[PDB]
Amino acid sequence: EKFSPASFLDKKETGVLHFVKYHGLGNDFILVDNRDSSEPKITQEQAAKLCDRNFGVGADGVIFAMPGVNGTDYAMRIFNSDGSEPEMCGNGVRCFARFIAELENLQGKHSFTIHTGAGLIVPEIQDDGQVKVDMGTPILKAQDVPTKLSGNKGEAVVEAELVVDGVSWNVTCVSMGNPHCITFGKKGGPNLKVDDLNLPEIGPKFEHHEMFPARTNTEFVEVLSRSHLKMRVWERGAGATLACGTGACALVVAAVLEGRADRKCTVDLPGGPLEIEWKQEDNHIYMTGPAEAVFYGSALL
Amino acid sequence: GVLHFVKYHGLGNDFILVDNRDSSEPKITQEQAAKLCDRNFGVGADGVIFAMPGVNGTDYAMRIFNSDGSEPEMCGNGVRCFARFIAELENLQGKHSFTIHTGAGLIVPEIQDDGQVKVDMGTPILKAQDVPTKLSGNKGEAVVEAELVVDGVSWNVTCVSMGNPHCITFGKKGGPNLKVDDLNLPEIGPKFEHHEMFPARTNTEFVEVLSRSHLKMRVWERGAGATLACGTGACALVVAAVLEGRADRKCTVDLPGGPLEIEWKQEDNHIYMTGPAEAVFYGSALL
Amino acid sequence: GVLHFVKYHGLGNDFILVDNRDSSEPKITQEQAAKLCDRNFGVGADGVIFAMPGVNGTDYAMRIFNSDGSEPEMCGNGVRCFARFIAELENLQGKHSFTIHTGAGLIVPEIQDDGQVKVDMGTPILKAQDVPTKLSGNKGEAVVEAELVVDGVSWNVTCVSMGNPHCITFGKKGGPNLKVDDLNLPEIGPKFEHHEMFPARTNTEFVEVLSRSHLKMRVWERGAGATLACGTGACALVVAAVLEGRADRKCTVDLPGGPLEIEWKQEDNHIYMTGPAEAVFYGSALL
Amino acid sequence: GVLHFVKYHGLGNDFILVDNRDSSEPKITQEQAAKLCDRNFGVGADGVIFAMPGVNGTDYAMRIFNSDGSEPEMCGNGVRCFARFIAELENLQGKHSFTIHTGAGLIVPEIQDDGQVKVDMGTPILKAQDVPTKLSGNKGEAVVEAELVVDGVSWNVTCVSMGNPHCITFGKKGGPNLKVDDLNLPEIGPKFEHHEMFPARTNTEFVEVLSRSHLKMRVWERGAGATLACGTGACALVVAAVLEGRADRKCTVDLPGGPLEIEWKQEDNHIYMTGPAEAVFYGSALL
Amino acid sequence: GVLHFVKYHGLGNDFILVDNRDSSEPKITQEQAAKLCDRNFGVGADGVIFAMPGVNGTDYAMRIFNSDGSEPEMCGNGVRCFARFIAELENLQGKHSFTIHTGAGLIVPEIQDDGQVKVDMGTPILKAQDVPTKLSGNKGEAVVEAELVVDGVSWNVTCVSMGNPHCITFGKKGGPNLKVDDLNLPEIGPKFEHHEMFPARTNTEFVEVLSRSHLKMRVWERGAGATLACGTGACALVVAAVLEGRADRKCTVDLPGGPLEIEWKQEDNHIYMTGPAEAVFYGSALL
Amino acid sequence: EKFSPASFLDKKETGVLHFVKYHGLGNDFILVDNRDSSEPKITQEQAAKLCDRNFGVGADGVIFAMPGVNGTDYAMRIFNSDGSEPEMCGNGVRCFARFIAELENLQGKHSFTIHTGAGLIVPEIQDDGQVKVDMGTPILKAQDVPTKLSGNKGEAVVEAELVVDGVSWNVTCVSMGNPHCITFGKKGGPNLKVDDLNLPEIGPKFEHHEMFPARTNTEFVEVLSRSHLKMRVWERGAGATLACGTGACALVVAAVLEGRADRKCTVDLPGGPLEIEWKQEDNHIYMTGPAEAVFYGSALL
Numbered sequence A, F: 001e002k003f004s005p006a007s008f009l010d011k012k013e014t015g016v017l018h019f020v021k022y023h024g025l026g027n028d029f030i031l032v033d034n035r036d037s038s039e040p041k042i043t044q045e046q047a048a049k050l051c052d053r054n055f056g057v058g059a060d061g062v063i064f065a066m067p068g069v070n071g072t073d074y075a076m077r078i079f080n081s082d083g084s085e086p087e088m089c090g091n092g093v094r095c096f097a098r099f100i101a102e103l104e105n106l107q108g109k110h111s112f113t114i115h116t117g118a119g120l121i122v123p124e125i126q127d128d129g130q131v132k133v134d135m136g137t138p139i140l141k142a143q144d145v146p147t148k149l150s151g152n153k154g155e156a157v158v159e160a161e162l163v164v165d166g167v168s169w170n171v172t173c174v175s176m177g178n179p180h181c182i183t184f185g186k187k188g189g190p191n192l193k194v195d196d197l198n199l200p201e202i203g204p205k206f207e208h209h210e211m212f213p214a215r216t217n218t219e220f221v222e223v224l225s226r227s228h229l230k231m232r233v234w235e236r237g238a239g240a241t242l243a244c245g246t247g248a249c250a251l252v253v254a255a256v257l258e259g260r261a262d263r264k265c266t267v268d269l270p271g272g273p274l275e276i277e278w279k280q281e282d283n284h285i286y287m288t289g290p291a292e293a294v295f296y297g298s299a300l301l
Numbered sequence B, C, D, E: 001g002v003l004h005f006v007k008y009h010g011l012g013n014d015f016i017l018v019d020n021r022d023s024s025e026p027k028i029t030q031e032q033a034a035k036l037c038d039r040n041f042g043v044g045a046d047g048v049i050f051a052m053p054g055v056n057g058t059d060y061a062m063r064i065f066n067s068d069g070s071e072p073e074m075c076g077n078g079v080r081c082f083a084r085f086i087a088e089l090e091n092l093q094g095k096h097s098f099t100i101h102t103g104a105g106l107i108v109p110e111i112q113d114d115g116q117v118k119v120d121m122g123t124p125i126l127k128a129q130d131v132p133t134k135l136s137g138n139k140g141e142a143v144v145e146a147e148l149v150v151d152g153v154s155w156n157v158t159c160v161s162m163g164n165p166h167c168i169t170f171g172k173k174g175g176p177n178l179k180v181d182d183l184n185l186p187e188i189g190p191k192f193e194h195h196e197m198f199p200a201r202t203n204t205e206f207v208e209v210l211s212r213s214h215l216k217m218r219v220w221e222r223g224a225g226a227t228l229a230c231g232t233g234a235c236a237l238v239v240a241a242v243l244e245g246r247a248d249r250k251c252t253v254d255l256p257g258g259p260l261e262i263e264w265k266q267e268d269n270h271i272y273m274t275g276p277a278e279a280v281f282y283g284s285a286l287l
């Protein structure tokens, strides 16, 4: 043993974080009641540590229920498991909805207005207990995705060439607050057999691509029918997760723009299906999916 | 239902510890444990460890369920967490040791001054049929650096039991030393785990000797996969290293999650393992 | 003066336990105990129990003072608290049994895995004169379903001693079964307690048979009144139930504060009582 | 958890006093208080009293939880115990007085030379709706000797508040004086306590006049039952006795546990109550 | 290196206690102990006390190093701290006694209800050469009120051993009683400590009789200087007081740090010492 | 045993303080990490008890590492062993430096800015491991020392007569934030043989002298050479300690003012030497000495 005053004091400074674990189709998060302030109870660094699955609580991210902004019922902020802060989370907002209904003991259908870095999001707990969320309107303007790729269909990047590690892929870029790069295959290549991809190998090349200043989420898609899409995703700062709500919304948008599918689809994600719909009437995207509580606890900080 | 527990981890090998001192019957089923161990849909862990009432005079008894639901007969990293768990529940202070009854027999963990836990892991079992393994003993009834054909490739392995089965290898037959980090465990691991020569499956540790008192390893556990550490595995590989004449009885073993001090005493044939154990959080899971 | 103690209760029968292992003489007088037991002006309890040094080789000895100051020869709920008290003092975890000398002879409680205590309450005493009672034995020297005139009303009672005296009744002579909850204990109880047929007063338990293995009761204790439970009383009433042929040797007894598992083994003629015992608080009272 | 406290009693009205000067929020919940007040399964008391930090300039603040968990706005016997508590904690000897903020407003206890505590219990509230009661005021806005139909029987009552509600009766309508000891409180009491005419329930005191300066009473408290004494109740009944013209402003009130000196000063409308308070024991309870 | 320990003090006589139950040899050297005892450059203490494994059947053994590094054969204040120290390591509650092997023989401390410790300090050794002292016995084989020339000045002293040597004086030869607080210990003390008549040096206690059952003292310890208290010293001075006919066998001894109750029972010739012992802090020191 | 509800409640209401023990030339302190609050973790009364060498941890004082103030890396506050709070501590700030370096795992040379009651103090760990501290500039104005003695050399009190218990001594007063009374002997008397002084007897007479409203530290000095001074000190609220950093600085200032020594001196204190230099260039005083950790632990409050 070594004499180390530093280590001694470290193992003394204690803190505790109370939370509830939820998951939306396998995309699991640590939800914390932060309605007592507009400042997150923990730092991004602490969140990263708590998300470690072996040394911490383990999750794809930490979601804070914050006080409303501009009159919304609440505000939501989230930290990825890598510590970065994205502007929205689809599976997360569904868990957020149930987390709220539990904290307020609300029964039945209920909708809340949530302020997020992506704008106004409005989830509504259905009767079946599922959650249908108004993910807002998609951003197609290239520079606002943001991507340095040049719009090749208006100001939008649709099925445009992206050179990834020397290989030419075709991608479509759309933002749901956070950036998404959707691809249905390589340029001049066949359809994808999503399960045959080596995500941990190809994913990082898209995530940190120079054409995406704020990095990006990437979803690989294989069309099963014009109303049935299968996908896998490599998230910005979270890796290969079992599901991504904003990503499912973005890929349906991309599928429509590329003319491969209708505005209403059933997206099969690794952890399960989501019902997505891009209402042409208002240009809003609606996402319907489950959300479940797993356990609640107190972690050391 | 609800299950109250405390999350601990020994060098990254994380477990769900539950106070089951009121009954000799585990509070949850093996199936429930498997679900709780799912990292995305459950609490997430390599296993569930129950602190049970003593047996035949021991202070306590320990039972564990792997993340796949199977029940192994011992767990080194887990017993270290078990000792600290008891110390917390009983609010004990300072050095304390406990007698624990396990599927491997008597195990005695002792909390050190520095907060680590030195455990008497018992004695290694080398008789082939008791490991158990169907490989023939080539050194007495022990299997030492014997040929094992895995998916058509000949590897050399040594088998030793610490209650649970272990298959240790320092490389392929007629091959060079291993660069453990270059192995593709999820690919090679399952071939050892479910090998026909291991009736109850086996834990497998790949080792590269750094010195006669310093070994580096990686492990593919039975029913738990590639974990960050394995206490019984670190004990078994030191035994194998000694039997193969590659290292001394006292070694520092480097596992993915950190080091463990191992010593196989010739004076009594017992193996002592010293390492850390830390609480992470505590909670209540829905059942 | 100051008295350090720990408050325990067995099914609501609460006691003040004191560590008196330093002397075979109680730290306080019976008068002091009576004052400490007052629920408004004192600590409040049904009695004070002293853990004393062993006698004739027993691990310990137990003495108790009722809340009225009198000293009974045994206490079932109290001996269960006694066992847990010692365990807390000596850091005894898990199952443990102790030999205890009492005014009723040897008593051997054993802490169970679930924290309850199974006690070997010895053998019952049925000889009339030793209960003691002046009623004449009508079945050998035992008083079974014999007529007892209480305040001019004829009741049928069975007398049995568990060290202390018990008068068990299942109803009036030539009357129907009892609806125990309809009885006015503070009115009828004292008439049995100080009855001339009981030289040392007696404990009285009223019973209503629910089944041959399930009995419901209420008790008016000697010097303690209507308590929530009485261990020796539950044992005595099962004995009486068997002697009167109303129930079997193994019964669940429902007392106001909860259930007890009683069994009068025909194999050894011993009675076993199993039930809980819980610590409430510890303090110091002014003497 | 564990709660440290000191047991006190004022004429038999016993309480659990806790030093809560470190926070403005009670250390325990109302539910926990109810459990701690259980006399067999808990510490046993008529209530829990917290010594809290001053408010708007007062030396301290007091909050109390009845043994049923509800929170009344004041407690006479309790504030006297509160005075001794503080004096004991601050080591104050001799005459001393503190300003205490309560749900009834400012209350000022003063320890006398003889050791007893004289308390300025504030002024009585007589406006019906503020008591509160749904009975209609028949003497100004006050309810004095007004008819109250209890379980079909007509009683005459007077309502007055000392922060908490009180229903005082000297007998049934058109009936003779009461022989308070002949009443069956557990039977009649609950009918007043939960009467529909008392939205927040009420404390009820039954009185029999011995002389115009000597009153005897018994009380059925809201959420506490038949206690040995009630300070706010003794103040309220003197007020009622005066309003009904049965007694003078200065009286000796005999409560089951002892007497209290009460004076309703016409000079300032304040009521002063003088009585004892004594520590009994102290300890730590398990939560 | 690092040394984990707990700081305790008995009436101001402070020590560094270390859990040495693992080995029969002290974790640190006498030189290291001397350095750790330095109050400015080290932890600061009058000595280091090791809790060692039992010898010849005793529960434990105790060894101590003075702040100067020398090893005395016993320590009264220290054994009281030892008892409470062990109580924690064994998670014991309440009264409990331990048998301890020391260089003075068997010592039996017993924890009392008030947290104090009553210790059976064994029997005193009065045989001159066994104290040891070179002074000739003038009362049997004992040195009682014998002349000792210190730096040319004649003092009268009584020698007694409690395992360790003690030189007690009530004043100079042919001189008046002492006003202990007027002595200049750092000046006179060393002259006694290293006196040629004490081969193993000696502890010296200066005493002034207040009554035949009340003695006041100051002490200059061998290898520790002027400490706030000395348990063996208090025992020895009572023995000396009795032998010189100045006091009774039962006395209250006032030491700079506080009082001790000493009793030299004629019944068995054993000396009993009761005093406090308190933990101060837990620490790890650099070695 | 007496029934005491108060004593009972006091005993169960105990806390804990984690700390590290350091010493600078024998002047030992209890250092506590108080960077998470601008308020000291313990009261002055508690500090006094912890400093008791037999009933407590034992130290000349408690030093708190506090958060920076108006642009400093940290702030330092100290409580004497008697509980009073001085405005600075030389030996303590050197221990403070190593404490921080150890907590921040800083290796090699490092300097920090510290806010104290005497102003800005800047300790700098040297390459040799010693700590050289910029102790600031001395305060010589009589009323600001503070002392009621009249200035006899400008606004400064230099070799002025001080009647102590009827005996006339000559003293020089200087402040290093805290007050110092330096004397090289009695008025009209010979040089001092510092080791022959009876500090516990003479010290208190200076400490509580009526001419020192806030009490004072007193250092007795004997000149060995114009660059070598020997001293002993009786500190305000701490008694005869083995060393005093602010005291060593103050006595060099006094020695210079009285023309007895140069501006660069080696000062010998009971516990060891200190290198002191009063730079004429900037009027700042620099003190160089050691600091060592001894042990760490948790004390009951």
Ligand SMILES: C[C@@](N)(CCC[C@H](N)C(=O)O)C(=O)O
Binding pocket: A027, A080, A085, A086, A087, A088, A089, A090, A091, A092, A178, A179, A217, A235, A236, A237, A238, A241, A243, A244, A245, A246, A247
């Ligand atoms: C997949 C996701 N959780 C998105 C998380 C945010 C993403 N990792 C980002 O950094 O853009 C969701 O919408 O459900």
Ligand SMILES: C[C@@](N)(CCC[C@H](N)C(=O)O)C(=O)O
Binding pocket: B013, B066, B071, B072, B073, B074, B075, B076, B077, B078, B164, B165, B203, B221, B222, B223, B224, B227, B229, B230, B231, B232, B233
């Ligand atoms: C690695 C291990 N956790 C062993 C767990 C049991 C193993 N998975 C098996 O099935 O034998 C340990 O010893 O520390």
Ligand SMILES: C[C@@](N)(CCC[C@H](N)C(=O)O)C(=O)O
Binding pocket: C013, C066, C071, C072, C073, C074, C075, C076, C077, C078, C164, C165, C203, C221, C222, C223, C224, C227, C229, C230, C231, C232, C233
């Ligand atoms: C009911 C009892 N506490 C008996 C107490 C003794 C009884 N009051 C008596 O005087 O015999 C028990 O056995 O548990």
Ligand SMILES: C[C@@](N)(CCC[C@H](N)C(=O)O)C(=O)O
Binding pocket: D013, D066, D071, D072, D073, D074, D075, D076, D077, D078, D164, D165, D203, D221, D222, D223, D224, D227, D229, D230, D231, D232, D233
């Ligand atoms: C009788 C009482 N304790 C009152 C307690 C509060 C009462 N139970 C209520 O609920 O108003 C007092 O004033 O001394």
Ligand SMILES: C[C@@](N)(CCC[C@H](N)C(=O)O)C(=O)O
Binding pocket: E013, E066, E071, E072, E073, E074, E075, E076, E077, E078, E164, E165, E203, E221, E222, E223, E224, E227, E229, E230, E231, E232, E233
């Ligand atoms: C005073 C003492 N600590 C004795 C310590 C041993 C003594 N310094 C010696 O050397 O004999 C005690 O008995 O309490």
Ligand SMILES: C[C@@](N)(CCC[C@H](N)C(=O)O)C(=O)O
Binding pocket: F027, F080, F085, F086, F087, F088, F089, F090, F091, F092, F178, F179, F217, F235, F236, F237, F238, F241, F243, F244, F245, F246, F247
């Ligand atoms: C000697 C000192 N520790 C000063 C401590 C403060 C002094 N006791 C005072 O009260 O001014 C230092 O500067 O090193």
